Design a protein around this ligand. Structure first.
Ligand SMILES: Nc1ncnc2c1ncn2[C@@H]1O[C@H](COP(=O)(O)OP(=O)(O)OP(=O)(O)OC[C@H]2O[C@@H](n3cnc4c(N)ncnc43)[C@H](O)[C@@H]2O)[C@@H](O)[C@H]1O
Length: 208
């Protein structure tokens, strides 16, 4: 069957997981790109044999599991390897993402993709939701969470797509500048629309 996909994105410290949990509370299955990336290298996964062949047998632990810290460290000391690893994992991530979307039974699925704009992944979504906050909020919340400097978070902000680049591809925008609670009402309104879009998209003769 065809699943209706709502992608969710936002920059660092915007509240992507916070908003995703509110949809999950309403019964929506959430597919998270970062969890999918960890799953393709789990014990017994196909990518593990390729990784051992490329980086060395010692990239694998005693029980057959990936020495994740050792891999992260090896790629940081060999920049070209980062690209080699992403190229190997990409198709596997695409397949696993599709598998999880097909396996979700909620009316529509919420696909949380931090790199949605950077990687042009909005092309694979039926609807795009952006959780938006000011840059100051991004900085303050990340600083509090990780106990890091303003400068450290600014560097991440400058590496990510801009706020305006995310807004330019959004169908809907949810504000998360307020406190942890205006989110429920806004999520409920969006959810009610998503249920309608999902119930009608397969037969919808004309565009919106
Ligand atoms: N590119 C990158 N480079 C380096 N580190 C990166 C990184 N991307 C992520 N991290 C690392 O992952 C953590 C969460 O990611 P994220 O900030 O992109 O996560 P989101 O899913 O957008 O956000 P949440 O985890 O939902 O919320 C983040 C923080 O804000 C708080 N928060 C959320 N809504 C709030 C609200 N309404 N009022 C006050 N605080 C709120 C949360 O408790 C949490 O401390 C970062 O702090 C950093 O450690």
């Amino acid at each position: 069957s065809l699943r209706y996909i709502v992608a969710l994105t936002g920059g660092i410290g915007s509240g992507k997981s916070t908003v995703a949990n509110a949809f999950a509370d309403l019964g929506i299955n959430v597919i998270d790109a970062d969890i999918i990336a960890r799953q393709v290298v789990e014990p017994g996964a196909p990518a593990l044999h390729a990784i051992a062949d490329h980086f060395g047998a010692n990239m694998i632990a005693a029980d057959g599991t990936l020495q994740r810290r050792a891999l992260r460290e090896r790629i940081f000391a060999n920049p070209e390897e980062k690209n080699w690893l992403n190229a190997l994992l990409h198709p596997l991530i695409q397949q696993e993402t599709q598998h999880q979307i097909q396996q979700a039974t909620s009316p529509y699925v919420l696909w949380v993709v931090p790199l949605l704009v950077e990687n042009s992944l909005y092309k694979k979504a039926n609807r795009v939701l952006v959780v938006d906050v000011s840059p100051e909020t991004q900085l303050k919340r990340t600083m509090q969470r990780d106990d890091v400097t303003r400068e450290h978070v600014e560097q991440i902000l400058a590496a990510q797509a801009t706020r305006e680049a995310r807004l330019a591809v959004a169908d809907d925008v949810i504000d998360n500048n307020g406190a942890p609670d205006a989110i429920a009402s806004d999520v409920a309104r969006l959810h009610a629309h998503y249920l309608q879009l999902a119930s009608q998209f397969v037969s919808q003769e004309k565009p919106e």
